[PDB]
Design goal:
By secondary structure, the chain is α/β, with parallel strands linked by helices. It is built from eleven helices and ten strands. β2 and β3 form a beta hairpin. It has one domain. The strands form two sheets. It has an eight-stranded parallel barrel, surrounded by seven helices. A two-stranded antiparallel ribbon has the order 2-3. The PDB classes it as lyase.
Length: 247
């Protein structure tokens, strides 16, 4: 459990504990991402915090901690022009990665096309700027397995570089079942090289983190879940991992 905890830590998109948004808490988050045993994969912050976070990470000598942010968030509304404007602003602020919320309510009402179009539009903006696009399908609101598969397939076909379970701001975030469903879609469509998976929530403990990673190890190589293909979107999980590692 020390190997999986160190592994999970190096795959963490770290965010602040109680959704704090101040400059100091963002600065502190940057310090928190440089752990005693290694750096998290990224930090997750709102777009306006990107310039100060980028300054902070460089000054601590950790340019490899990626800066991830969110757009169309957390609502997942179905207005493409708004999602696209927010994504272009996230890019312009300096994001390394943009997590866009899929219009899951529209999909639930039978409008698959707007989710395809919105993801495609944001992917094209991100790809031209060498920015990775994660797509939050909000599996905890879709609830139905076939809807989770559907949102995953649409996002992948539209160009998602990652599919991400959840915003973290609804009642149900990631579960082991939705994680398996989403990773099964990646396998069944044959896109394991181009599409990663991100669990947001769900994992509270080091033991949780181990179990989530084992699903990826079962479906793909034990080598598949590197930073390009696997992330934990978490906050309190970092403390549990560090304690498992003796810190």
């Amino acid at each position: 459990l020390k190997a999986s905890s160190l592994r999970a830590l190096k795959l963490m998109d770290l965010s602040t504990l109680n959704g704090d948004y101040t400059d100091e808490k963002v600065i502190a988050l940057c310090h928190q991402a440089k752990t005693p045993v290694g750096n998290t994969a990224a930090i997750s912050i709102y777009p306006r915090s990107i310039p100060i976070a980028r300054k902070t990470l460089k000054e601590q000598g950790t340019p490899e901690i990626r800066i991830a942010t969110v757009t169309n968030f957390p609502h997942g509304n179905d207005d493409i022009e708004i999602a696209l404007a927010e994504t272009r602003a996230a890019i312009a602020y300096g994001a390394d990665e943009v997590d866009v919320v899929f219009p899951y309510r529209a999909l639930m009402a039978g409008n698959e096309q707007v989710g395809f179009d919105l993801v495609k539009a944001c992917k094209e903006a991100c790809a031209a700027a060498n920015v990775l696009l994660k797509v939050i399908i909000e599996s905890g609101e879709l609830k139905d397995e076939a809807l989770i598969r559907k949102a995953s397939e649409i996002s992948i076909k539209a160009g998602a570089d990652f599919i991400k379970t959840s915003t973290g701001l609804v009642a149900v975030n990631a579960t082991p079942e939705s994680a398996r469903i989403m990773m099964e879609v990646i396998r069944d469509m044959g896109v394991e090289k181009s599409v990663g998976f991100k669990v947001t929530g769900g994992a509270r403990t080091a033991e949780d983190a181990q179990k989530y990673l084992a699903i990826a190890d079962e479906l793909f190589g034990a080598d598949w879940a590197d930073a390009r293909h696997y992330r934990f979107g978490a906050s309190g999980l970092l403390a549990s991992l560090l304690k498992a590692l003796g810190h």
